[PDB]
Design a protein around this ligand. Structure first.
Ligand SMILES: [Cl-]
Length: 389
C-alpha cells in the first residue's frame, strides 16, 4: 500500500528530472551516456544494499538507468533546432544531480523498509503510475519484475552433497535448446552441459531426475532433486520456497504463429481478438503470461511442449506466446512458422533452480559468474541451434 506508492513516487520523480538533464547536456554538447557516473552510482548503490540480493538490485537500478537514458534520447529528438540558453538550463552538478542522489538514497531506504515489512506489490498500481512515461514495454516489465525479486526474502543440501557427492539434477527434456533428447535419444542441450560443468567443478556425479512444468515446484518441495535446469525463468512466485542462481540468459516473451498469418497477428492488439486461438503448454510462465495479458482470445492448454508447434503448423491454433529464444528456434526449425512481434513484450531471465540452502547458492554463483566471464554462453547457445543474434 503505502510503501509501494512511495517507491513508485520516488522512481517517477527521478525520471521526471531527466528532460532537465538532457537540456543541460544538449547545451554543453554532452552525450547522454556517461560511464564514469554510471559505474560510481552503481557501486554506491551496491554498497548500500548489502542485505538485498545484489543481482536483482543491480538489475533494478540498471533498468532505471536504461529508462532514464531513453527519456533523454526522446528529449534529444525534440531539441535539434532549438536555441537553449544559460537561462533555459538547470545546473547538472549543483542542482539536478544532488536531487537525483537524494532520491536514489530515499529509494534504497524504501527498499529496505518494504523488504523488512513484506510490502506486497500490485502490477495494476505500477501500470497506472508509470502509464504516462514513454517507455518500451519490456523496460516497464523489467522494472516491475526486478523490483518484485529484490523484495523477495532452509535445507542443508550442500552438507549432504559434500558427504555423498551425488548431485540430483531435475530436467524436463521438453525445451530445446535448454534440455531435450537428441535423435539417438540422449539428453542434450545448454543446461545438460552447464550441469555437467557444475558437477565437474564440485567433484559430483549427476543423477538426472525427470520433472515437468506442472510438477516442478511440488517436485522441488518434495526434495526430489538438489537443483533443476531446463530454461527455468527466475520469478518471485518460484522464490516463494526455492532459490535461484545468478541468471545465465536474458530475454522475454514474444509470439509465434504462421508466416501466412503475420499481417493479421503482428501486434498484441491484433493477436488478442476472439477469432484468435491461442495455444500454450501447462504450468509455467507461458501459461501465467497468456492468462494475465489476454482478455479476448481463446486459450487452449496443450499437454506436450514437444508437439505444441505442430498445432500452429497444422492450423489447429493461431499463436503461442513463449520465450524469444524458443520462438526464434522454432521459426528456424519450421518453414511455415514466423516470429509475429517486432520485439519481446516482457523481461525475463533464466537461472538454475536450487533447494533453499544459502551456502549452496553462494557456491553455485561463485562458479557460474566465473564460468560466464570465461566462455561465451553464446557458443554453447549456438551449438544447440541459437543464432547469436
Ligand atoms: Cl528469451
Amino acid at each position: 500500500n503505502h510503501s509501494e506508492q512511495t517507491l513508485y513516487q520516488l522512481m517517477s520523480e527521478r525520471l521526471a528530472l531527466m528532460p532537465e538533464v538532457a537540456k543541460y547536456k544538449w547545451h554543453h554538447n554532452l552525450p547522454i551516456e556517461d560511464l564514469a557516473r554510471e559505474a560510481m552510482v552503481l557501486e554506491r548503490t551496491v554498497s548500500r544494499t548489502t542485505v538485498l540480493d545484489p543481482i536483482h538490485t543491480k538489475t533494478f537500478f540498471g533498468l532505471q538507468m536504461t529508462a532514464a537514458k531513453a527519456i533523454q534520447a526522446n528529449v534529444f529528438q525534440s531539441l535539434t533546432n532549438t536555441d537553449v540558453v544559460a537561462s533555459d538550463v538547470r545546473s547538472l552538478n549543483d542542482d539536478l544531480r544532488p536531487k537525483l542522489t537524494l532520491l536514489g538514497d530515499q529509494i534504497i531506504e524504501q527498499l529496505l523498509i518494504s523488504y523488512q515489512n513484506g510490502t506486497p506489490l500490485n502490477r495494476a498500481h505500477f501500470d497506472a503510475h508509470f502509464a504516462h512515461f514513454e517507455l518500451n514495454p519490456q523496460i516497464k516489465d523489467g522494472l516491475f519484475k526486478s523490483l518484485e525479486l529484490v523484495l523477495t526474502p532452509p535445507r542443508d543440501t550442500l552438507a549432504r552433497l559434500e558427504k555423498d557427492k551425488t548431485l540430483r539434477v531435475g530436467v524436463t527434456l521438453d525445451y530445446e535448446p535448454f534440455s531435450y533428447q537428441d535423435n539417438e535419444g540422449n539428453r542434450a542441450g545448454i543446461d545438460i552441459e552447464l550441469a555437467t560443468a557444475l558437477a565437474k567443478e564440485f567433484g559430483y556425479r549427476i543423477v538426472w531426475v525427470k520433472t515437468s512444468w506442472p510438477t516442478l515446484m511440488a517436485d522441488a518441495e518434495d526434495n526430489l532433486f538438489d537443483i533443476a535446469l531446463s530454461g527455468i525463468s527466475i520469478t518471485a512466485q518460484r522464490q516463494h520456497r526455492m532459490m535461484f542462481s545468478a541468471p545465465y540468459h536474458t530475454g522475454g516473451k514474444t509470439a509465434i504463429g504462421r508466416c501466412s498469418s503475420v499481417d493479421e497477428l503482428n501486434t498484441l492488439a491484433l493477436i488478442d481478438r476472439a477469432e484468435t486461438r491461442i495455444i500454450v503448454n501447462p504450468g509455467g510462465t507461458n501459461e501465467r503470461f497468456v492468462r494475465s495479458a489476454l482478455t479476448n482470445a481463446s486459450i487452449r492448454i496443450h499437454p506436450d511442449n514437444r508437439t505444441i508447434f505442430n498445432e500452429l503448423v497444422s492450423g489447429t491454433a493461431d499463436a503461442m506466446f513463449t520465450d524469444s529464444i524458443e520462438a526464434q528456434l522454432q521459426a528456424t526449425k519450421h518453414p511455415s512458422l514466423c516470429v509475429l512481434l517486432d520485439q519481446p513484450l516482457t523481461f525475463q531471465q533464466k537461472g538454475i533452480l536450487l533447494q533453499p540452502d544459502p551456502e549452496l547458492k553462494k557456491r553455485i554463483d561463485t562458479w557460474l559468474l566465473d564460468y560466464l566471464s570465461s566462455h561465451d554462453v553464446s557458443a554453447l547457445f549456438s551449438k544447440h541451434g541459437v543464432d547469436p543474434d
